[PDB]
Amino acid sequence: MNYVIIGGDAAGMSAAMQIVRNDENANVVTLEKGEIYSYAQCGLPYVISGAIASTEKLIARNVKTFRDKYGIDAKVRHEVTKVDTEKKIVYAEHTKTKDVFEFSYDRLLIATGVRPVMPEWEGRDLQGVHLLKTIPDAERILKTLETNKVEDVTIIGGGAIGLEMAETFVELGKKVRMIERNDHIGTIYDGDMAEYIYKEADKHHIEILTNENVKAFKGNERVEAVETDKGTYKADLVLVSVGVKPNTDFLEGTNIRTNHKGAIEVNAYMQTNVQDVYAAGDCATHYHVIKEIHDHIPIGTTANKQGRLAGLNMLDKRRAFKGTLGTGIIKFMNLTLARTGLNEKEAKGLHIPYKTVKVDSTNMAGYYPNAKPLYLKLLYRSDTKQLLGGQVIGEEGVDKRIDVIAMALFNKMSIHDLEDVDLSYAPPYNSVWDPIQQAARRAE
Amino acid sequence: MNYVIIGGDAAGMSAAMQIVRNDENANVVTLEKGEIYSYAQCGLPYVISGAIASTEKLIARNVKTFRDKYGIDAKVRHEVTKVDTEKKIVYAEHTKTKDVFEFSYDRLLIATGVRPVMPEWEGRDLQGVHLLKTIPDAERILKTLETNKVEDVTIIGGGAIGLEMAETFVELGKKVRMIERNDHIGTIYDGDMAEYIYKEADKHHIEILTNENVKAFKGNERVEAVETDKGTYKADLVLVSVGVKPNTDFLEGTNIRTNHKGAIEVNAYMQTNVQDVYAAGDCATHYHVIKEIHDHIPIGTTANKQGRLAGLNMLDKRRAFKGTLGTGIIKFMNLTLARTGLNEKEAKGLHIPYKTVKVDSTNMAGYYPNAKPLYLKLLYRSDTKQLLGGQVIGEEGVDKRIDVIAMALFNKMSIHDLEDVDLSYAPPYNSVWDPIQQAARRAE
Numbered sequence: 009m010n011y012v013i014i015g016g017d018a019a020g021m022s023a024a025m026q027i028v029r030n031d032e033n034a035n036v037v038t039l040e041k042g043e044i045y046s047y048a049q050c051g052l053p054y055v056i057s058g059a060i061a062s063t064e065k066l067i068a069r070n071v072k073t074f075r076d077k078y079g080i081d082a083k084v085r086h087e088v089t090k091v092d093t094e095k096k097i098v099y100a101e102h103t104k105t106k107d108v109f110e111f112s113y114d115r116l117l118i119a120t121g122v123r124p125v126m127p128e129w130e131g132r133d134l135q136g137v138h139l140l141k142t143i144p145d146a147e148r149i150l151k152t153l154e155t156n157k158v159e160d161v162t163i164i165g166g167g168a169i170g171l172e173m174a175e176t177f178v179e180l181g182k183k184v185r186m187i188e189r190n191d192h193i194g195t196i197y198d199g200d201m202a203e204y205i206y207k208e209a210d211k212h213h214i215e216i217l218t219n220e221n222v223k224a225f226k227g228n229e230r231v232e233a234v235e236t237d238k239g240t241y242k243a244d245l246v247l248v249s250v251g252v253k254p255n256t257d258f259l260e261g262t263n264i265r266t267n268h269k270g271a272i273e274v275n276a277y278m279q280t281n282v283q284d285v286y287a288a289g290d291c292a293t294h295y296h297v298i299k300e301i302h303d304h305i306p307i308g309t310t311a312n313k314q315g316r317l318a319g320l321n322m323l324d325k326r327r328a329f330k331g332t333l334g335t336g337i338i339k340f341m342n343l344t345l346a347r348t349g350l351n352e353k354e355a356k357g358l359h360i361p362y363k364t365v366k367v368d369s370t371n372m373a374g375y376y377p378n379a380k381p382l383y384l385k386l387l388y389r390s391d392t393k394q395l396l397g398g399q400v401i402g403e404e405g406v407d408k409r410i411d412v413i414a415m416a417l418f419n420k421m422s423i424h425d426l427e428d429v430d431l432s433y434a435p436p437y438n439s440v441w442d443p444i445q446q447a448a449r450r451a452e
Numbered sequence: 453m454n455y456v457i458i459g460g461d462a463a464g465m466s467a468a469m470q471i472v473r474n475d476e477n478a479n480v481v482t483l484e485k486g487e488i489y490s491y492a493q494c495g496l497p498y499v500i501s502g503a504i505a506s507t508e509k510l511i512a513r514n515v516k517t518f519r520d521k522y523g524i525d526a527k528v529r530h531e532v533t534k535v536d537t538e539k540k541i542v543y544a545e546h547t548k549t550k551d552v553f554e555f556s557y558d559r560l561l562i563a564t565g566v567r568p569v570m571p572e573w574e575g576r577d578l579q580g581v582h583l584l585k586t587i588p589d590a591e592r593i594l595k596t597l598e599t600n601k602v603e604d605v606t607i608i609g610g611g612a613i614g615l616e617m618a619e620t621f622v623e624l625g626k627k628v629r630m631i632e633r634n635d636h637i638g639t640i641y642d643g644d645m646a647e648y649i650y651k652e653a654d655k656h657h658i659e660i661l662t663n664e665n666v667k668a669f670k671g672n673e674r675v676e677a678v679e680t681d682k683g684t685y686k687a688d689l690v691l692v693s694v695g696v697k698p699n700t701d702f703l704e705g706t707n708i709r710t711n712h713k714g715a716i717e718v719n720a721y722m723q724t725n726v727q728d729v730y731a732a733g734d735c736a737t738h739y740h741v742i743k744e745i746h747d748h749i750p751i752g753t754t755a756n757k758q759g760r761l762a763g764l765n766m767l768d769k770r771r772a773f774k775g776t777l778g779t780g781i782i783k784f785m786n787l788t789l790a791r792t793g794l795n796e797k798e799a800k801g802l803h804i805p806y807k808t809v810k811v812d813s814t815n816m817a818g819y820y821p822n823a824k825p826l827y828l829k830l831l832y833r834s835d836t837k838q839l840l841g842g843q844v845i846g847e848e849g850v851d852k853r854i855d856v857i858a859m860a861l862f863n864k865m866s867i868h869d870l871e872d873v874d875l876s877y878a879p880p881y882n883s884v885w886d887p888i889q890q891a892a893r894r895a896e
């Protein structure tokens with residue numbers, strides 16, 4: 009009956025909505041550190057590029073609707089600093105006044121996501137050095153672009169956010185450099201597939217520096233350069249995108265179990281090891297359908313799914329989380345980059361015996377106008393032929409293929425079974441055998 | 453060792469290639485009535501529209517390649533007129549010289565497809581009255597368009613071909629009318645989804661006539677009008693697209709079993725009831741994954757799969773055909789029209805208890821530029837919640853959704869399990885919950 013939720017975004021409010029819809033007696037208090045509930049972080053790079061009019065467009069439901077329409081007691085500017093799991097009390101600080109409030113719970117959900125990491129580099133705090141996570145973050149980047157002469161941009165790190173932001177700055181007419189981390193090589197794409205990414209970057213004049221270590225950001229009051237172990241380069245704006253950390257520091261002393269990076273362990277039902285405490289989203293671990301271990305792959309689709317499940321389970325509407333597949337998709341310049349399941353680094357790290365098939369193909373009938381190349385790779389088990397993962401790169405029809413591969417991994421299909429599926433074909437959409445099925449046929 | 457195949461297209465040559473690849477000693481004779489092997493009938497409307505340079509582009513493999521590279525004794529202009537299943541002899545008549553040849557078989561495959569039906573209308577034979585099946589057919593339509601002054605085009609019938617051809621003639625700048633058969637209402641799309649098709653046709657000034665019966669085609673040497681039971685309309689070119697008949701006429705007298713429309717019955721292994729006689733493609737029946745009965749849904753994806761399977765089984769590499777889902781996709785003007793599994797007419801005819809969910813949604817994040825409307829309908833069993841079928845209509849991202857639905861149907865998934873699949877999401881491709889999942893959530 010008293011439900012407390014910490015975090016006011018995808019996971020926390022997916023949970024809140026379930027409770028509110030399915031328990032009319034429920035007293036729901038939500039605790040959010042900032043001033044903005046339920047917004048699409050994913051739209052941030054597209055507001056910065058100007059493709060979306062403003063950050064207000066990213067708001068999915070405001071705090072006024074949560075309060076007035078749904079009877080949720082949604083707090084803004086409340087940062088939780090401590091949880092007492094024996095007394096069942098949450099302590100929150102008002103972020104302006106610093107006055108302390110306490111909230112009694114019957115069931116608690118931790119839905120506090122992750123934060124971007126800023127390594128301990130000289131110059132970290134120079135004006136124009138940025139992280140990107142929140143609407144205020146995006147506004148500070150725009151403010152730097154508005155109030156300065158920005159021509160050279162350096163991105164530290166790659167991955168989804170780094171690549172999307174490279175595109176965003178290219179589209180804003182900047183000269184973009186990105187300095188990539190070698191600990192992140194092979195983590196998303198195999199090396200033979202990442203080649204298409206390097207080619208596309210190079211084609212659009214995005215300089216990618218490999219095997220080079222940042223050491224300081226240089227400047228007086230603002231950044232003007234980035235220093236690495238191999239040079240110093242002019243930069244008028246630096247975006248740091250090198251990793252994330254679960255926002256779980258405040259739970260120190262609660263006995264709530266955490267993996268090595270600080271993500272909260274959850275069982276099938278979003279429950280922690282501590283009675284009546286739950287977790288969901290980027291702050292929690294994510295059972296992996298193919299690894300069969302609790303991984304950490306923080307994304308918004310998983311966050312919404314786990315938050316919804318956590319709400320249902322907190323109402324005792326028992327329902328197991330089926331897992332994540334590690335699915336990810338990125339728009340990068342002219343290319344779409346998609347992957348799901350295990351890549352080679354992951355399969356090797358698990359000691360799962362696998363083979364691969366790679367096909368350079370087209371997204372549709374080769375004779376049809378504007379058929380575009382499509383590169384597709386599948387991993388499958390050597391013994392049982394179970395499909396393990398796929399990576400797809402090209403300009404069109406990539407999302408279709410990764411979604412089909414995601415479906416196959418979800419159903420634990422053997423690679424050769426993909427040959428039997430009655431997928432759609434007409435000349436404007438596909439070939440009579442889909443690229444996935446042609447790759448399946450080449451498998452042993 | 454002596455394999456005889458009748459039909460030199462998708463099913464027949466898919467079989468041929470398997471036999472040739474997997475039996476070094478095999479003597480393969482293929483018998484094709486026309487002069488063209490292995491071509492994409494699907495590309496024909498797109499050659500006619502000018503989108504594809506010529507019919508030559510549609511040829512996948514030459515008879516010269518089959519003969520020289522693969523050692524297949526590929527005959528052209530050989531029309532099989534009878535089969536003696538006791539003596540195991542195939543009788544073919546040369547289409548020009550009328551000479552008769554005998555071919556002895558150890559295993560026989562019938563891969564003779566369907567033919568478009570021309571009802572017995574006065575004027576059937578007027579110049580400018582056309583069927584569309586073969587490359588010569590497309591050439592004759594082009595000849596009519598090149599010579600004759602064509603302004604008004606009438607299409608009799610609908611379905612994929614009628615719709616694709618209405619677009620083709622619009623793009624060639626003609627005034628297009630379609631006269632639709634009421635025996636085919638609800639057979640492909642439910643009435644509520646067909647509405648989008650009528651709106652789209654009307655939008656582009658394609659006049660569609662309903663509950664109106666053709667009576668005659670009028671003209672001198674060439675066609676110039678179409679008469680129905682309600683009027684007579686100018687037409688300089690008529691395309692008739694009212695149904696297909698399996699090309700199995702010639703088998704009368706054998707004991708080879710056929711369904712009511714003449715399609716040859718095949719078991720799991722593409723075998724007829726007659727020892728050592730197989731069938732595949734449009735001339736055969738198609739086991740339906742969801743109906744659990746042998747249907748007839750002639751389409752090129754199925755023909756290639758069945759032909760390949762027939763070749764394999766003819767070599768005793770035993771492999772069962774898993775079935776068809778009745779998947780179909782059409783480009784029509786600005787819309788993509790897709791369906792798979794059962795629609796309401798099919799579910800009702802089978803007495804399967806079902807419910808439906810319909811969602812008016814978008815293909816991607818609503819705040820992202822050029823997000824387009826997406827209309828999606830699912831049917832599911834009211835008892836077990838098994839997904840039964842789906843129809844998807846919209847401008848972009850329709851093929852992706854139907855392929856995901858096809859995968860779900862293939863795996864016999866419950867509608868609510870769709871909520872748990874880790875499908876891809878980024879703002880340019882989808883919403884955080886795919887439309888399929890939002891519809892799934894609305895189901896009982």
Ligand SMILES: Cc1cc2nc3c(=O)[nH]c(=O)nc-3n(C[C@H](O)[C@H](O)[C@H](O)COP(=O)(O)OP(=O)(O)OC[C@H]3O[C@@H](n4cnc5c(N)ncnc54)[C@H](O)[C@@H]3O)c2cc1C
Binds near residue numbers: 016018288
């Ligand atoms: C630039 C960018 C692009 C992205 N693109 C995609 C994409 O294309 N596809 C995709 O699926 N995902 C994408 N994501 C990720 C997706 O946005 C997140 O996974 C999702 O927001 C996670 O939801 P969550 O509720 O777990 O955490 P969050 O959305 O981070 O919400 C956590 C909330 O908790 C609050 N909080 C933290 N600590 C406390 C505390 N002590 N007290 C009170 N409140 C606290 C924070 O203020 C925050 O609002 C992207 C993210 C970024 C930054």
Ligand SMILES: Cc1cc2nc3c(=O)[nH]c(=O)nc-3n(C[C@H](O)[C@H](O)[C@H](O)COP(=O)(O)OP(=O)(O)OC[C@H]3O[C@@H](n4cnc5c(N)ncnc54)[C@H](O)[C@@H]3O)c2cc1C
Binds near residue numbers: 435458
């Ligand atoms: C305009 C059009 C558009 C299409 N679009 C699509 C689409 O978008 N997607 C899709 O999946 N499918 C599409 N199809 C259907 C697809 O083309 C067919 O399903 C596929 O060609 C069927 O292959 P099949 O080998 O069984 O029959 P066919 O390809 O018809 O081949 C049978 C062959 O047998 C020969 N033959 C017949 N009788 C005899 C005889 N007695 N003796 C000797 N030879 C004989 C014929 O000459 C023919 O070449 C389309 C068809 C048309 C006409």
Ligand SMILES: CC(C)(COP(=O)(O)OP(=O)(O)OC[C@H]1O[C@@H](n2cnc3c(N)ncnc32)[C@H](O)[C@@H]1OP(=O)(O)O)[C@@H](O)C(=O)NCCC(=O)NCCS
Binds near residue numbers: 021046308309890895
């Ligand atoms: C906005 C947010 C609170 C969603 O709240 P929600 O109420 O769960 O979602 P909706 O408002 O779409 O409502 C969904 C429910 O209403 C039901 N519903 C919606 N329309 C319906 C209709 N017309 N008829 C019947 N039922 C309907 C749905 O079936 C669904 O039911 P369920 O929850 O029992 O499965 C949550 O997603 C959020 O905070 N998001 C943050 C933004 C975000 O997603 N960020 C990550 C993006 S990277």
Ligand SMILES: CC(C)(COP(=O)(O)OP(=O)(O)OC[C@H]1O[C@@H](n2cnc3c(N)ncnc32)[C@H](O)[C@@H]1OP(=O)(O)O)[C@@H](O)C(=O)NCCC(=O)NCCS
Binds near residue numbers: 449466493494512513
């Ligand atoms: C063209 C046609 C003969 C295909 O013949 P095919 O030889 O089976 O097809 P391909 O040439 O693509 O060869 C496929 C085989 O080679 C193998 N192969 C292809 N490239 C390979 C490679 N690079 N490395 C290893 N193996 C490869 C495939 O795995 C496949 O093997 P399998 O048959 O054992 O599964 C047949 O589809 C046809 O006649 N089509 C008519 C046109 C049509 O499709 N019409 C209907 C469209 S509507």
